[PDB]
Nucleic acid binder design. Structure first.
Lengths: 479, 27, 239, 445, 331, 173, 60
RNA sequence: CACGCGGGUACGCUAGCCGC
RNA sequence: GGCUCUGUGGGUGCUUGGCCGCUGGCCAGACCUACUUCAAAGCCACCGGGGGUACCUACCGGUUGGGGAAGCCCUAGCGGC
């Protein structure tokens, strides 16, 4: 019939924007509760339906490339062919920085992709606006540099020196150094909480609140130096990856790991985790990489193999992933589809960047454009890959063209809605659920032959006599 | 053709003429 | 500062604006209107005024009627030049060079200046076709319209052969024929660019006596100064 | 078939316009921590309303000399108030110019017990002297009354009809008596047939005309039908009731402010049980008044408190207090249903606001949307522990806090005595009588 | 400027019509992206601070042409399920915030009235006409549009209501008074062709009240006669014309306009043997007028203008034509 | 509770229709005073309903010399007949807000269904007409031909000269 | 960050991006800048030496 | 209850019978 | 003819190739996603001085309710210490 499209529309919107199963109105016994819950179910149904109908006003289109003939394959496509076939405002972004004498470089974009920071190993830390081509800062620092990271804006950044971390302003003037964070080898900035989480080489993980300036919870990961660290963008829990070959999930409200996904036989070399929090791809020292469903904590498919222990892996805003191993990175497209209940293995990579003798230190996706920045020992190299990048951003959350007034107002609103670090769990939507023990105690204070042998075995050891045990002795004598 | 000239004029006014702009470019 | 040099070359080679102040300045650069008015002008106002100018130009000369369909179109109100591919940009460059060769004869007139203002304010010809635009305004290097074009030109977008114009961009005065002739005797690239422009026009039969007299005078004085430079007295060097 | 996503800055500003275009994608992958960010915004909303909760607005004029023992608004106009004090002087105030009174007169000898406005422009006042009528709005000011009435015992309160020129005065002889202005002299005295105790308050029902409620010091409420001039029903409660009032949107609901520290919302058709019991006070409740929207209540108590209530709440939405406010005798809304007025025993008429953190005037759309968003967010997440403790914290004076701690101890002791007598007496095999059913002692006709 | 958040509502309102057009095969997805971008640019131009009635009219014209294009395409693809009601509702919304922003622009008010009359909205047209008349009460064109459309509908009492309030306001120029006399005599002609009214005393009353107005000139009374002289096929037309002539003769005795109405009086309903008889009568009046003591240049310019009006018709005799030329040339 | 309000200025007289009327108890409050200051929060209160300009400076001179003396003019009666809903005050009235008390009495005597509130007596309509006099240049600018400054200048000169009889005994220049 | 409003400041009472409480009133930065120390490591080395010297005086 | 396109009784018009 | 400034190439350490998934290939690349038996041994791991300790965390010792690896025995079991 003609209403079949209507029922399909409602099923699709209840899948996507519904955020829950539905309230069962037939089991409600109260009359006023029944009509108010029917009113609420009508309002939530039209809410999801109007969001799905207003998903037509999205402006941009997702990029792609598809092979035409039967012999042509997508991984044999050259960057010169992409640059010839693509528009000029996005063919401008395929550059290459040639910085040779100051260590392997480490790239990190800001979370709108306006400014990128690249840090050499021997000290050369620079901060540039890579589309407009101007550099905001460049400074040399002397000693080694473990990791450089932007903070909430492109105003402040944070560099991990030979002992401490240092946070710097937009001009590069050093605001301060953090002395509690010694020998920091990895850093990750939670964006919605204002926490900066640092793994030392000793295995200690410190969460420092950036806004107010006090370290929230120093967790000591009891086993080994950590090899890698990433951050779930959906839970804000930290997937750190150890050297015995397990990845452990950490949160500032517990000193034990939340889960520990057992992984590759050697140490895991790199991690990456989806921005919807669905799946995690990890690459180990044993040459395999493998993906996990995170919402169920099981392995999705068999282990893919990489032909070298992959130094970095970073997955995009859409389904693409760049796994950078040895001296050339490969991009895979369909590793984890959200819609499929049982995942299938991908035969061929989506596209491969060339191996011409520059060992890849770190690959990163520019968060809203369809490019990929590889930081290697010869410097920085930005390549363009069409399928990646979220085509339609939201101007309220994060904006690639944010003016000065919009940046000021957004920083103040993010300060006002910074989340307390005790609001971190495996499921981030728990706020308002039942304390079941407290509800059972409230209802209690409102309404007011195989185990009874190990009972006596446990209570003969106290040796309190405790009249319930006298009743249990009489029961055992009767038995 | 199965389109009126008034319908093609309304299509060029309302909806845009990007395809025939590219056609007028590549000559 | 090798990184600052690489980033300076990237920022000079970049073409599309990426922040709001850059978009407002690049939209503010105009021939006719002052910048305070030319910031706040949509592409319907500019198209109405400059299409009145092109209607006057198309009633003057007959051969502007293909540009009536491709460059001055109501759909060409909306086309962004930086979002099309390289072959679309190259075909647009060919259409712009053909229009500039066609409009060079009538360039003292306000209809033709309105048409060039449409090309400048929509397709950004002062940034993407600086060679042909500067060459077609070079025979009129004694007029206030050339002074305004020299004012709105970007500095690093000028070709290397026309970089004698930098003091005349720093102080907004029209350059003299002595400066153009002296740079023609010193650089072979400027003389080759002027002669290539006028021969590429004259093969398409869009010549005019101002351009012909301009090229004849500057190549005559440039060959004069070039012979006076080439004379050496040593036999092998003069050979 | 290569195509990558190209973003011009035309997607942020079209050239030639100052409008910053804000493209929005509502997909949930882009907006993490939905429930957590909304909890943080609700917590900010509670802390913001506790910061901007500033309810005291002003005080009408210099006040009275002795305390304000009666006051009455004009239900037709919007800025006409009057207040009669304890030394028997009445004043008519205009709420637009609160600097000085509009018209004052040394009305009576004793305190002014009741006071009201007529529907034309004139006002009436009771005393133990007898009731009087004045014209406070006249081109010469006249201190002398234009009618007076002494026969009918000692009068206690007044209530004017909604439409006509009828009014009922509650006397101390156990009767009310009803006058029609301009063609009645002594009025008609309606009484319960053998009734002796004084009728304290009287209130015409404004929705259903010709239905009159009254309380009396027999701890009883009585009704009256004016169409067939007789009493209707009489129920005896447990404690004395200070004041009856009706709901201006629901014709059948009434509220009695009673010496049980309590407000009882009753149904006039079924006096079996109370529809609601508001319990929050410390000393006796002196005055209750429904909002003109019919969904809120003010109660001025005999200790130093005003308590603002929703209609279905059963506990305080707000409490207002002040060291200068000595006792509270008469509280009533303005017809905006936004500001409340308080006639005290310090001789002061004070103007507070209900919705203490909500400022008046014209708001911009992104201002009133932020306020409505905060109110909806508190309606959802108002029961969580942090949000709950900050939204319930209010600073009470030391006497009221100490006496409500004593009242909690005494009520818990009485509940424990009753529960022990139930568990060890023969009442164990009965259903527990609900508290709204226990609110009424007997009902008779 | 909250213009993004302000235009979000109008785009989210126009979205489900685009969803219906995409789920039918009427507009393809690239064309619907073009419609989205064009409506978004139009809304962010319309709700801008510095705006213009031509901008509101460009948006109105685009939405109305989109409705016409979809009507042509729907009739070509043979669908009857898609209706034009949402497009008419959003066009009325554009026009309502247009007349909210710029109420002093009669071009936009008249475009609103033309749109509401064209898509068959008579009651809405009357409400828009009342608001436009309240904002521009001195506008004779709006008053005549109201009165003539109420007479075209046939509600002559409402047409008289609009016209009498209009003549109460517009008393500087004669224009609305002439149009009211024209409408009242057209009602008289409708009352005749349907076969008090038998007397037809209302244009005489209009003349008698117009005698004391601030526009009351002999040229204005000549404009009254030039209005009255059309559609002479009536009953009391000779009564009205004779009253106009005796009023002008008793008030402005020797004016060239009064001599012109003395010339052109006896040619009321003539087209035919009664034509040259009354022409010879009028030419006797004209020759007496030319010899009489009046401003001969003014009277001659009036007569050569009326003689151009005479020469505009065919089907006459050449001797009469050449004697009109001979009497013309020496003026 | 106000429904409409008259407002007479030198270019003509316009009557506004109030929607979302002003709070009368919090008139002396700082937030409501800031709302009366800002045009973005007072144009939500007033919406321009009708405008009647003068035909000539002679009509403007007759308008002042009637209005200041108190008596209403025939064209003000005309525009009120046109804009106000025709009632008699037996079951429904219309509240108009005017600046002067004598003009209030005369409009109420000419139209029995219109109850007028004078700005000299009522503080609500006083503050509301005060806000309209504050923002009177921007509330009319869509149909304000030219300015108001030269109109007020020439009209004050014409009114003062008609009151003084200046030109008949000033001759020395 | 812009200058915080009244209510925004009252909600962010304990907030400043520049000086924390672990920065020790930027005493390190003020002393390094005053005495032209080209190494913050040299400041903190001198400071830990002075701290060991002060605890020796404390045990004496 | 009616709302698109055609031929009809009829137009400086669209009110009425049947279809596409 | 001279001063100054700038650019490119070589040199400023002793001469064995460009790249790769390197015993072989490629420099025009080719094939693309396999194969699988048993997670891991422990320790250390740099914050300036004196002081406070309500709350959080670390360590140590306990308390209720559940849980049972392993050790021991035999009336053999859904076992028992």
């Amino acid at each position: 019939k003609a209403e079949l499209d209507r029922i399909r529309r409602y099923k699709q919107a209840q899948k996507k924007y519904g955020r829950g199963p539905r309230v069962d109105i037939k089991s409600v016994r109260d009359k006023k509760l029944r009509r108010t819950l029917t009113n609420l179910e009508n309002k939530y149904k039209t809410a999801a339906l109007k969001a799905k109908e207003a998903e037509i006003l999205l402006e941009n289109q997702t990029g792609f490339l598809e092979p035409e003939g039967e012999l042509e394959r997508t991984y044999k496509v050259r960057q010169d062919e992409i640059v010839k076939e693509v528009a000029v405002e996005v063919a401008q972004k395929k550059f290459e920085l040639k910085l040779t004498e100051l260590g392997p470089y480490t790239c990190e974009y800001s979370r709108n992709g306006r400014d990128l920071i690249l840090a050499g190993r021997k000290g050369h830390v620079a901060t540039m606006d890579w589309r407009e081509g101007k550099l905001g800062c460049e400074l040399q620092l002397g000693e080694t540099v473990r990791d450089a990271r932007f903070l909430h804006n492109n105003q402040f950044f944070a560099v991990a020196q030979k002992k401490y971390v240092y946070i710097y302003d937009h001009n590069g003037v050093e605001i301060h150094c953090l002395r509690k964070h010694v020998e920091v080898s990895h850093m990750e900035f939670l964006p919605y909480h204002f926490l900066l989480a640092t793994l030392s080489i000793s295995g200690q993980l410190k969460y420092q609140d950036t806004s107010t300036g006090q370290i929230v919870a120093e967790i000591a990961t009891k086993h080994g130096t950590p090899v890698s660290l990433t951050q779930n963008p959906y839970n804000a829990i930290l997937h750190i990856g150890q050297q015995n070959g397990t990845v452990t999930l950490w949160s500032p409200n517990s000193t034990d790991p939340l889960v520990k996904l057992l992984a590759h036989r050697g140490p895991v070399r790199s991690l990456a985790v989806d921005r919807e929090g669905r799946y995690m791809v990890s690459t180990g020292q044993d040459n395999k990489m493998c993906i996990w469903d995170i919402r169920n904590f099981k392995e999705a498919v068999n282990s893919y193999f990489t032909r070298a222990p992959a130094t970095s892996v970073a997955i995009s805003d859409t389904g693409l992933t760049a796994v950078g191993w040895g001296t050339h990175t490969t991009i895979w497209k369909g590793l984890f589809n959200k819609e499929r209940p049982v995942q299938v293995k991908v035969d061929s990579p989506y596209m491969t960047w060339g191996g011409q003798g520059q060992v890849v230190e770190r690959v990163r996706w520019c968060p809203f454009e369809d490019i990929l920045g590889i930081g290697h020992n010869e410097g920085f190299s930005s390549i363009i890959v069409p399928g990646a990048g979220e085509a339609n951003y939201d101007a309220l959350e994060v904006n690639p063209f944010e003016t000065k007034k919009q940046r000021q107002e957004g920083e103040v609103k993010a300060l006002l809605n910074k989340l307390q670090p005790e609001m971190i769990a495996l499921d981030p939507n728990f706020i308002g659920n039942l304390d079941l023990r407290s509800e059972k105690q409230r209802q209690a204070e409102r309404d007011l032959n195989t185990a009874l042998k190990k009972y006596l075995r446990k209570q003969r050891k106290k040796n309190i006599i405790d009249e319930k045990r006298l009743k249990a002795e009489e029961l055992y004598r009767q038995m | 053709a199965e389109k009126d000239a008034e319908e093609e004029e309304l299509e060029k006014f309302v909806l845009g003429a990007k395809e025939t702009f590219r056609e007028q470019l590549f000559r | 500062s090798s990184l600052a040099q690489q980033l300076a070359q990237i920022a000079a080679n970049s073409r599309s604006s990426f922040n709001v102040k850059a978009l407002k300045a690049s939209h503010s650069k105009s021939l006719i209107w002052e910048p305070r008015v030319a910031v706040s002008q949509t592409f319907a106002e500019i198209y109405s005024q400059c299409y009145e100018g092109f209607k006057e130009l198309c009633h003057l000369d007959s051969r502007f009627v293909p540009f009536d369909a491709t460059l001055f179109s109501a759909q060409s109100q909306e086309v962004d030049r930086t979002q099309m591919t390289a072959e679309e940009n190259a075909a647009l460059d060919k259409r712009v060079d053909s229009f500039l060769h066609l409009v060079g004869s009538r360039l003292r007139l306000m209809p033709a200046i309105k048409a060039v203002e449409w090309l400048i304010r929509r397709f950004r010809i002062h940034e993407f076709n600086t060679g042909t635009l500067l060459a077609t305004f070079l025979p009129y290097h004694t007029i206030p319209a050339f002074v305004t074009l020299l004012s709105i030109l970007p500095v690093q977008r000028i070709p290397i052969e026309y970089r004698f114009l930098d003091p005349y961009i720093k102080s907004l005065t029209p350059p003299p024929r002595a400066a153009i002739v002296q740079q023609a005797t010193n650089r072979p690239d400027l003389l080759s660019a002027i002669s290539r422009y006028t021969l590429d026009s004259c093969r398409a039969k869009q010549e005019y006596p101002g351009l012909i007299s301009f090229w004849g005078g500057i190549m005559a004085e440039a060959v004069n100064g070039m012979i006076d430079k080439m004379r050496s007295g040593r036999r092998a060097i003069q050979l | 078939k290569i195509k990558a996503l190209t973003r011009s800055i035309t997607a942020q500003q079209a050239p030639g316009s100052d409008v910053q275009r804000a493209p929005r994608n509502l997909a949930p992958e882009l907006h993490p921590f939905e429930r957590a960010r909304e909890y943080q915004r609700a917590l900010n909303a509670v802390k913001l309303e506790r910061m901007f909760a500033k309810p005291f607005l002003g005080q009408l004029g210099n006040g009275h000399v002795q305390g304000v023992y009666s006051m009455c608004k004009d239900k037709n106009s919007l800025n006409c108030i009057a207040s009669g004090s304890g030394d028997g002087v009445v004043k008519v105030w205009d709420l637009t110019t609160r600097d000085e009174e509009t018209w004052r007169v040394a009305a009576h000898n004793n305190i002014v017990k009741g006071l009201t406005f007529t529907n034309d422009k004139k006002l009436l006042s009771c005393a133990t002297d007898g009731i009087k009528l004045w014209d406070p709005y006249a081109s010469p000011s006249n201190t002398t009354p234009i009618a007076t009435w002494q026969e009918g015992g000692p009068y206690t309160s007044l209530s004017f009809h909604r439409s006509a020129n009828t009014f009922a005065a509650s006397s101390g002889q156990g009767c009310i008596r009803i006058w029609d202005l301009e063609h009645s002299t002594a009025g008609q005295a309606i009484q319960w047939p053998s009734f002796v105790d004084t009728i304290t308050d009287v209130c015409f029902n404004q929705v259903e005309t010709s239905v009159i409620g009254s309380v009396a010091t027999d701890r009883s409420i009585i009704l009256f039908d004016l169409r067939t001039n007789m009493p209707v029903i009489k129920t005896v409660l447990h404690f004395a009731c200070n004041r009856i009032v009706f709901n201006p949107m629901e014709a059948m609901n009434l509220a009695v402010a009673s010496e049980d520290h309590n407000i009882y919302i009753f149904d006039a058709r079924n006096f079996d049980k109370a529809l609601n019991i508001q319990k929050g006070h410390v000393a006796a409740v002196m005055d209750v008044e429904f909002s003109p929207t019919g969904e809120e209540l003010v109660s001025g108590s005999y200790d130093r408190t005003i308590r603002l209530w929703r209609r279905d709440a059963g506990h305080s939405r707000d409490v207002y207090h002040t060291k200068r406010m000595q006792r509270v005798f008469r509280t009533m809304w303005t017809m905006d249903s936004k500001y409340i007025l308080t006639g005290s025993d310090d001789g002061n008429v004070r103007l507070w606001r209900a919705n203490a953190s909500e400022r008046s005037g014209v708001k911009a759309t992104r201002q009133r949307q932020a306020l409505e968003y905060n109110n909806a967010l508190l309606d959802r997440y108002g029961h969580l522990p942090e949000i709950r403790r900050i939204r319930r914290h209010r600073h009470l004076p030391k006497v009221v806090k100490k006496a409500t701690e004593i009242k909690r101890e005494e009520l818990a002791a009485i509940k424990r005595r009753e529960e022990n007598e139930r568990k060890h007496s023969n009442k164990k095999y009965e259903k527990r009588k609900s508290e709204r059913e226990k609110a009424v002692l007997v009902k008779q006709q | 400027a909250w213009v993004a958040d302000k235009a979000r509502f109008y785009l989210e309102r126009a979205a489900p019509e685009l969803r219906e057009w995409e789920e039918k095969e009427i507009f393809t997805k690239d064309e619907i992206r073009n419609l989205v971008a064009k409506r978004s640019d139009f809304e962010h131009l319309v709700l801008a601070p510095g705006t213009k009635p031509t901008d509101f009219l460009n948006y109105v014209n685009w939405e109305r042409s989109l409705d016409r294009l979809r009507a042509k395409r729907c009739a070509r693809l043979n669908i009857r399920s898609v209706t034009s009601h949402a497009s008419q509702a959003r066009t009325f919304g554009i026009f309502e915030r247009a007349v909210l922003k710029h109420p002093g622009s009669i071009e936009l008010w008249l475009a609103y009235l033309e749109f509401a009359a064209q898509v068959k909205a008579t009651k809405r047209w009357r409400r828009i006409m009342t608001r436009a008349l309240r904002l521009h009460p001195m506008n004779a064109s709006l008053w005549t549009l109201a009165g003539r459309r109420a007479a075209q509908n046939g509600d002559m009492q409402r047409a008289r209501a609009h016209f009498l309030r209009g003549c109460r306001f517009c008393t500087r120029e004669p224009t609305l008074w002439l149009e009211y006399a024209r409408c009242e005599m057209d009602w008289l002609a409708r009352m005749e062709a349907k076969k008090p009214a038998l007397s037809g005393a209302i244009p005489i009353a209009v003349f008698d009240v117009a005698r004391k107005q601030p526009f009351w000139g002999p040229a204005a009374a000549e404009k009254f006669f030039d209005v009255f002289a059309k559609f002479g096929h009536l009953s009391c037309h000779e009564r009205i014309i004779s009253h106009v002539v005796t009023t002008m003769q008793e008030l402005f005795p020797n004016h060239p306009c009064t001599w012109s109405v003395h010339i052109r009086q006896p040619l009321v309903g003539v087209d035919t043997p009664a034509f040259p008889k009354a022409l010879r009568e009028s030419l006797a009046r004209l020759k007496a007028a030319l010899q009489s003591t009046t401003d001969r240049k003014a009277l001659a310019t009036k007569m050569v203008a009326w003689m151009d009006g005479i020469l505009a018709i065919e089907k006459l005799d050449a001797a009469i034509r050449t004697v009109l030329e001979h009497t013309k040339r020496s003026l | 509770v106000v429904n409409f309000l008259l407002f007479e200025s030198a270019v003509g007289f316009s009557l506004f229709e109030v929607v979302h009327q002003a709070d009368t108890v919090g008139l002396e409050l700082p937030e409501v005073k800031d709302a009366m200051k800002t045009l973005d929060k007072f144009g939500k209160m007033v919406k321009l309903r009708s405008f009647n300009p003068w035909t000539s400076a002679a009509q403007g001179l007759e308008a002042i010399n009637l209005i200041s003396e108190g008596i209403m003019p025939e064209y003000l009666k005309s525009a009120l007949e046109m804009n106000l809903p025709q009632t008699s005050g037996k079951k429904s009235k219309v509240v108009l807000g005017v600046a002067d008390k004598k003009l209030a009495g005369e409009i109420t005597a000419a139209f029995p269904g219109v109850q007028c509130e004078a700005a000299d007596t009522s503080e609500v309509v006083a503050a509301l007409l005060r806000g309209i006099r504050t923002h009177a240049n921007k509330l009319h600018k869509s149909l304000q031909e030219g300015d108001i400054g030269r109109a007020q200048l020439g009209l004050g000169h014409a009114y003062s000269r008609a009151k003084v009889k200046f030109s008949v005994h000033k001759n020395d220049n | 960050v812009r200058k915080l409003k009244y209510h925004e400041q009252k909600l962010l009472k304990k907030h400043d991006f520049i000086n924390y409480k672990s920065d020790n009133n930027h005493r390190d930065h003020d002393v390094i800048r005053r005495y032209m120390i080209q190494k913050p490591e040299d400041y903190h080395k001198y400071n830990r030496l002075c701290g060991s010297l002060r605890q020796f005086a404390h045990r004496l």
